[PDB]
Write a protein that binds this ligand. Structure first.
Ligand SMILES: Nc1ncnc2c1ncn2[C@@H]1O[C@H](COP(=O)(O)OC(=O)c2cccc(O)c2O)[C@@H](O)[C@H]1O
Length: 535
């Protein structure tokens, strides 16, 4: 159910050296041999060399093959920032199996969607993380008939398969498989705009291209110490340049269990982190913690680059990074569907602090168009369309949606409103898609509304973003009840299985939506008007 690049583009990208033919199977073997003696992973009291990560992943791949996982099978991986993540992912790559990445904040709704859509053979989870019991979630899917036939638990397994059972056998390279580099290597989740998130297939050639190129843009090497402050399987901390870029270059990946200033600064001090990636709300927390005293003592001198991305970062705050934290800001405007934009580490500070960067590739095609797909004069704001060597041509098994998300000639409709500077840098100025961006976590208004409408006491509902100085937007729900408690409504939404960050920050019960002409405007227009009230 994947959509391939046209043959002429594929030829172009291989001839240009973007698509090298290397697979993630090749990657695991080559990087763990090339950097064997170096420190690869620091986390949860563990310190693994590249050699140890190689041996551990070979053992785990043998165990997954014994379990029944074969080349081409999909395996949903929903693990927190713990070292087991890497050994699990590498092991799946050794087998030619496809990780399907879920984030720790995802819940029964999203996980059911991923398992059923990807027809996943296994689900890999922790026992508990941040108060949530993933074993109970997996048992809920089993009870409903939607769970993978194999559930593997890191920690205390309950009645599921403990991860340790997959380490029982010595390595057997006979069970490994090398796929084709043009095959999908894994699936990940899109931010989401309609009722359900779409799955994104990424191939070995295109993803590894974006990783190698990002590693070069971000000056990674064996001296790199990358702090994974964000959930490590998200596109940003995974490939931009993320932990994959760090492994490609031979550096050390340090796992932060949470992004709080105390935890993160302690790791930066101890492990001498050189680069990390955060969303703007976390950046603001770190800046305030240092500038206004609480963490002024911390030694952050090893930090060379602070990446901030996923949501808009105001120039006012961007200007504080070098003076407060002593490092270079890098803005990163990317998307799970492909295109990633970086400010360059040698750009002047006005470009660094006022733009969201320029694309990775010379073959990243950028069209900024009006409502009739006509290009706008250079410098004006318009809809961003993009096409390139690591941007998909379609979502997984989503042909109806693909008809609308891509133009006939293969440009992806990002849903972003941007303008272009004379140097090619982009400035993110708005959005056109139905999608509240809560400090980097994306919430579809239509999805939350659909779940709210499922409540018996509710007659209508409209979900809109409310401007927020830290998060950009919080989630506000207007609800017309034929009303239930606010606490009770949020409880029902948690019982529905909605991701943690999709639960509304604010609920306002109303006899009618406080806008003029409710029966005469579309739902999208309604949300725009309501949100205008809240700014
Ligand atoms: N600097 C920015 N300013 C404004 N909006 C931004 C933004 N950086 C993303 N955004 C919004 O986030 C959407 C994509 O979201 P996502 O799939 O989560 O990926 C990511 O955030 C992501 C980020 C960096 C690198 C990477 O490799 C990623 O995958 C965009 O289209 C836009 O709306």
């Amino acid at each position: 159910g994947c959509t391939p690049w046209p043959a002429e583009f594929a030829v172009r990208y291989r001839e240009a050296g973007y698509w090298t033919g290397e697979t993630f199977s090749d990657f695991v073997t080559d990087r763990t041999r090339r950097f064997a003696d170096r420190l690869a992973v620091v986390g949860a009291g563990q310190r693994w060399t590249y050699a140890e990560l190689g041996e551990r992943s070979a053992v785990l791949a043998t165990g997954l093959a014994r379990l029944g996982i074969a080349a081409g099978d999909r395996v949903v991986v929903q693990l927190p920032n713990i070292p087991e993540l890497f050994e699990v992912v590498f092991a799946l790559f050794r087998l030619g199996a496809l990780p399907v990445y879920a984030l720790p904040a995802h819940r029964a709704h999203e996980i059911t969607h991923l398992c059923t859509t990807a027809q996943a053979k296994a689900l890999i989870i922790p026992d508990r993380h941040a108060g949530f019991d993933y074993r109970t979630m997996a048992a809920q899917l089993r009870h409903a008939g939607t769970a993978p036939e194999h559930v593997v638990v890191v920690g205390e397994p309950g009645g599921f398969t403990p991860l340790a059972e997959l380490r029982a056998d010595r390595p057997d390279p006979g069970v490994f498989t090398r796929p084709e580099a043009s095959d999908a290597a894994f699936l990940q989740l899109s931010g989401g705009t309609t009722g359900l998130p779409k799955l994104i297939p990424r191939t070995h050639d295109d993803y590894l291209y974006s990783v190698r190129a990002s590693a070069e843009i971000c000056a990674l090497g064996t001296d790199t110490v990358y702090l994974a402050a964000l959930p490590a399987v998200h596109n940003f901390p995974m490939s931009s340049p993320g932990f994959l870029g760090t492994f490609h270059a031979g550096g050390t990946v340090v796992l932060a269990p949470n992004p709080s200033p105390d935890t993160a600064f302690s790791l930066i001090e101890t492990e001498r982190v050189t680069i990390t990636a955060v969303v703007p709300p976390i950046a603001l927390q770190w800046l305030d913690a240092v500038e206004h005293g609480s963490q002024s003592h911390r030694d952050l001198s090893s930090l060379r680059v602070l990446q901030v991305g996923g949501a808009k970062f105001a120039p006012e705050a961007a200007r504080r990074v070098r003076p407060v934290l002593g490092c270079t800001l890098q803005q990163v405007f990317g998307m799970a569907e492909g295109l990633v934009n970086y400010t360059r580490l040698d750009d002047p500070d006005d470009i660094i602090t006022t733009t969201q960067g320029r694309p990775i590739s010379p073959d990243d095609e950028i069209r900024i168009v009006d409502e009739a797909d006509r290009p706008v004069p250079d410098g004006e704001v318009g809809h961003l369309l993009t096409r390139g060597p690591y941007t998909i041509r379609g979502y997984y098994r989503a042909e109806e949606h693909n008809a609308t998300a891509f133009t006939p000639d293969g440009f992806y409709r990002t849903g972003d409103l941007v303008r272009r500077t004379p140097t090619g840098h982009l400035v993110v100025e708005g959005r056109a898609k139905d999608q509240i961006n809560r400090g980097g976590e994306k919430v579809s208004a239509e999805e939350v509304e659909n779940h709210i409408l499922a409540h018996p006491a509710v007659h209508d509902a409209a979900v809109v973003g409310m401007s927020d100085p830290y998060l950009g937007e919080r989630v506000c729900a207007y609800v017309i009840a034929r009303p239930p408690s606010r606490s009770e409504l949020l409880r029902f939404l948690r019982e529905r299985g909605l991701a943690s960050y999709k639960i509304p920050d604010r609920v306002e019960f109303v006899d009618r939506f406080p806008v003029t002409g409710v029966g005469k405007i579309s739902r999208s227009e309604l949300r725009r008007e309501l949100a205008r009230r809240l700014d």
